Amino acid sequence: KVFGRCELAAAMKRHGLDNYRGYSLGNWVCAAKFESNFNTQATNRNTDGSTDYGILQINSRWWCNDGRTPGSRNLCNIPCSALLSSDITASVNCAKKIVSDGNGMNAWVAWRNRCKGTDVQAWIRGCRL
């Protein structure tokens, strides 16, 4: 599924993410836009054999198992594939873990380079929230 700006905002909110670990809702819509273009079915292979999955592009070397990344720790205890479903519950649930470990949303290349320190509230401008 390919989410709408607004619709994802609303949903991430419903799912406990507005200000989770101190990151505005916008910080999250932003990261997801530039990470997957609101497309939950997105995947991307990195050079190290790992692959990135879903709306929030969670990695398989640590968070989820996709049965073809060796180093692999499945800290989220979910099959990677789960993260691609039209319900974002699994992805949020797992994203909560990632963001709490230690580096905040720095764990997400794209948030850091394209989201961090910009007026992220602009991503939920217009929304019934």
Side-chain angles (χ1 to χ4, degrees), residues 1 3 20-21 26 30-31 35 39 45 51 58 60 64 69 73 77 87 91 94 99-101 108 113 121-122 127:
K1 173 185 207 173
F3 274 85
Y20 182 79
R21 271 301 182 118
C30 180
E35 210 63 85
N39 186 5
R45 200 133 216 205
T51 288
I58 306 171
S60 69
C64 67
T69 320
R73 275 170 170 177
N77 236 288
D87 183 293
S91 292
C94 183
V99 82
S100 300
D101 295 354
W108 281 286
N113 293 338
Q121 276 179 150
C127 320

Side-chain angles (χ1 to χ4, degrees), residues 62-82:
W62 326 89
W63 311 117
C64 67
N65 180 53
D66 65 352
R68 73 161 169 166
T69 320
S72 264
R73 275 170 170 177
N74 172 203
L75 275 306
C76 327
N77 236 288
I78 209 74
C80 290
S81 56

Side-chain angles (χ1 to χ4, degrees), residues 16-28:
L17 276 181
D18 182 353
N19 291 286
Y20 182 79
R21 271 301 182 118
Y23 291 104
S24 139
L25 207 189
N27 268 289
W28 300 107

